[PDB]
Amino acid sequence: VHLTPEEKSAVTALWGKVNVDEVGGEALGRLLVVYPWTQRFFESFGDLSTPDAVMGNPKVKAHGKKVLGAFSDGLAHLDNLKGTFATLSELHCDKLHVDPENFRLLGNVLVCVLAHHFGKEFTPPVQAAYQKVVAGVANALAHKYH
Amino acid sequence: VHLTPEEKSAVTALWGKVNVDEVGGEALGRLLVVYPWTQRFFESFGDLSTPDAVMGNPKVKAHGKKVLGAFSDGLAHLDNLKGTFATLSELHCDKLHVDPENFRLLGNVLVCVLAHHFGKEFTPPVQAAYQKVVAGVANALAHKYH
Amino acid sequence: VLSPADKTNVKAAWGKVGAHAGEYGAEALERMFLSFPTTKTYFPHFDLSHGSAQVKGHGKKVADALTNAVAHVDDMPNALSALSDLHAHKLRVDPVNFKLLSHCLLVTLAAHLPAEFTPAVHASLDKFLASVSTVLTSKYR
Amino acid sequence: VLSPADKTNVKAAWGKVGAHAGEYGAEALERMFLSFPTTKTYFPHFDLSHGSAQVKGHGKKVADALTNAVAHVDDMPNALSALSDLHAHKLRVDPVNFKLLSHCLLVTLAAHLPAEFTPAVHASLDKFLASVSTVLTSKYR
Ligand code: HEM
């Protein structure tokens, strides 16, 4: 997970324009719509029966806020993602039983949401930097599985 | 990535019994037979037209030995596979243009070959230690790609 | 695409497995849980202790499904229809895991079939398990 | 399998792409080479930097193949037959890479289609590109 200085600055500049609560809700909802088997962790969230039921689901939205909030905090620690996400990794393994493939899927959905929101501003070099970030975060979240 | 002392001892114990020549030739040969798209790198090896042709090919045998020889050397650096394979990673990227997915395929073929040779001695814990090793070696060989 | 020659190899190899199928199914699961610990996230409700009767019972079910698939190798989408429904709608196992079980099934076969696990047979069994996996994930979305 | 709604969504989205298909194909390739450097192993003979003439040309080819797949969305195995043979036998591109181009195509679509790239349409496009990818890797062994 090696970002160039230019990439680090592009990551930070774009993220400064991100509504984390909104983007989080959008990314988690899109995950559950695009890859509907990921709904398996969210039985208690109620209606997930159609794209609109999922995207507008208040529990999905609330959960997306939490998830992207933790992601956002991690962007301040790009040189130590494994340490940053160690307790969340342990939690998702031991208590939540979430296959880490889910982290990879969410990363790619998040990249789509950023593209959708930012349009031409989400350039190929900006995407490439975010691909490094999202791979690093997924790898960090998978790291304490056992 | 990081092997426990018990895993390390299990790896080293098995490897001390490995015929690197038979296992290397068998692993590379099976990679080419089972995933024939991998033959793309080896047309200069000559006749690769049937399974028997691939397996008995002197150049496949020689290359399998060479590849597994470098793998074997790597087992003395289990805590710094990335450092040790750095040169080879760059070579496979820049000079040989080998997709790193090939290292992952080879690793799983190697595990099959070890199972085939050792039978019941290749127990589930021994396999599990080897899976960590082959994942680590593939990752180390992929690490310098750009 | 499973060729007629693959089908020949698969039928012959599974024939040799014979009544050991259930045992090998359990062994493949044990190997998968140890080698690929993320797959345990699908079995938190299981007893995963050494020699678990629950795991052994499940391996028998996996093995029987494979025996059925071999017996109906020309018509696998039909033979496996209820199992495909189950994995798609209820279990919801991420598709990446099917390659992990398939690999562990191959390793198990290799470990028990010294004479039969030739390069050609290895290739055919890999294709077969990939085909099974394709059918079992066909209804996911 | 693509649902009736998936096909409506894919046809509508690719319809909106319209005359930009070739531009978007080139952009998706550029995004792939930058984001996923291992894919560059298949194009050692290409200039793979920004504004590459080889990439612009190749994107037009990729786009045309996708347009044809949309036109023959109920018979992709046959409509893409020659291209499947090419990737399986001449180019021998590892199947893992198809998901990387697919993702880069979705990102490109997202960046250009603010109104049309809804969650349902995204889901349909992902399934469509997965299906194209499955066809293109169907003849590998
Ligand atoms: C070769 C591929 C596979 C075959 C042939 C297979 C076969 C089966 C069978 C026969 C059952 C029992 C169904 C029933 O009770 O009606 C089952 C259930 C199940 N399978 Fe699979 N399966 C495969 C892949 C997987 C994978 C890759 C995973 C995850 C790593 C998985 C996870 C499960 C789970 C969690 C259950 C339910 C266990 C329970 O709570 O009773 N399966 N499978």
Ligand code: HEM
């Ligand atoms: C949506 C998936 C894809 C589509 C629709 C597609 C389409 C095409 C088309 C239309 C051609 C030109 C065919 C011709 O000249 O007759 C081509 C060539 C090629 N493709 Fe793909 N492709 C896809 C995925 C990939 C991937 C993932 C890779 C590797 C990362 C790849 C590597 C190549 C290469 C190396 C060539 C030959 C370039 C040359 O002329 O030297 N393709 N592809």
Ligand code: HNI
């Ligand atoms: C689809 C599965 C899934 C994904 C992709 C995902 C991806 C991520 C990512 C990736 C960027 C991050 C940083 C993250 C962070 C969090 N997750 Ni995840 N989680 C997932 C399933 C959950 C579940 C399940 C919970 C518990 C929800 C509940 O019901 O309370 C959860 C709970 C959390 C919590 C709250 C912990 C607690 O309750 O103590 C945080 C923070 N997470 N999750």
Ligand code: HNI
């Ligand atoms: C399918 C492709 C493929 C795989 C899976 C693979 C897997 C590996 C692994 C994995 C464990 C290792 C340790 C390894 C080691 C080596 N490879 Ni790889 N190589 C591969 C394709 C090659 C090619 C091609 C060459 C050049 C051979 C030649 O003809 O010169 C090569 C050459 C080498 C060399 C010789 C380099 C030199 O001349 O100094 C070593 C050592 N390697 N290769």
